[PDB]
């Protein structure tokens, strides 16, 4: 397992998301589903020119999996996934520019719910999670696990868990007072409210 330091900009955004008082936390789900949808759009478009792109899995879907025992909510997609370079370098670049733009918008009067317009909606996960674990598999690399509980660092290591084929799993280790997002009625409510028109099947698993 390798440990990396977040750059100042993104580290500051993570602290803002965790420290700022903001009750409309439910928007985190909309943001993660949108990220999954975007990733599914990407692998699907690539498959239009090269059908073999789907040899790692033809199914294009999004699954929402709650687990009360582990107190986790996992958003699973069979999108394009992320390579090690995406995890460490490429997305670091996006996180920096996206954070700078978002911060300037906030000081102007923008709201936290608009975070997705800046390409860093993934970080809205910290509105409800104390730790986020990302398991991902891209056609051009092996399966990896990215993880962070903030505090200025994140880790990346090869993942020996169940082979995914292709895609991304965002595991939200929920804060003690955010267990409402593990309830079927709550998740169904949020999905219908903000993600009813997503162009891929969203399956809400139950326990």
Ligand X SMILES: Nc1cc(C(=O)N[C@@H]2c3ccccc3-c3c(-c4nc5ccncc5[nH]4)cccc32)ccn1
User: Is position 39 an interface residue for ligand X (rule: CB under 6 A)?
Assistant: yes
User: Is position 118 an interface residue for ligand X (rule: CB under 6 A)?
Assistant: no
Question: Quick one: which of 73, 79, 129, 159 contacts ligand X (CB under 6 A)?
Answer: 79
Residue 82, SS3 per DSSP? coil
Q: CB within 8 A of 181, min separation 6: which ones?
A: 26, 29, 66, 73, 128, 172, 174, 187, 190
Q: Which residue from 77, 64, 90 is spatially nearest to 35, judged by alpha carbons?
A: 77
On the CB side of 120, CA atoms within 13 Å amount to 24
Question: Closer CB to ligand X, residue 162 or residue 176?
Answer: 162
Structure tokens at 44: 């699907």
User: Is position 165 an interface residue for ligand X (rule: CB under 6 A)?
Assistant: no
Chain-centroid distance, C-alpha 89:
17
Question: Quick one: which of 78, 113, 168, 195 contacts ligand X (CB under 6 A)?
Answer: 168
Binding segment (CB under 6 A) for ligand X, from list 31-39, 56-64, 171-179, 189-197: 31-39
User: Which parts of this chain interact with ligand X (CB under 6 A)?
Assistant: 6, 10, 35-36, 39, 77, 79-82, 87-88, 91-92, 94-95, 119-120, 122, 134, 146, 168
């Amino acid at each position: 397992m390798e440990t990396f330091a977040f750059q100042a900009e993104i580290a500051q955004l993570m602290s803002l998301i965790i420290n700022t008082f903001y009750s409309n936390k439910e928007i985190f789900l909309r943001e993660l589903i949108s990220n999954s949808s975007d990733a599914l759009d990407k692998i699907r478009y690539e498959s239009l020119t090269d059908p073999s792109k789907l040899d790692s899995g033809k199914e294009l879907h999004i699954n929402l999996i709650p687990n009360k025992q582990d107190r986790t909510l996992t958003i699973v997609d069979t999108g394009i996934g992320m390579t090690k370079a995406d995890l460490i370098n490429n997305l670091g670049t996006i996180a920096k520019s996206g954070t700078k733009a978002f911060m300037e918008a906030l000081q102007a009067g923008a709201d936290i719910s608009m975070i997705g317009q800046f390409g860093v909606g993934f970080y809205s996960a910290y509105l409800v999670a104390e730790k986020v674990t990302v398991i991902t598999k891209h056609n051009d690399d092996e399966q990896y696990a990215w993880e962070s509980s903030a505090g200025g660092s994140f880790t990346v290591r090869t993942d020996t868990g169940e082979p995914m084929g292709r895609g991304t799993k965002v595991i939200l280790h929920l804060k003690e007072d955010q267990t409402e997002y593990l309830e079927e009625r709550r998740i169904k409510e949020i999905v219908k409210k903000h993600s009813q028109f997503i162009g891929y099947p969203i399956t809400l698993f139950v326990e």
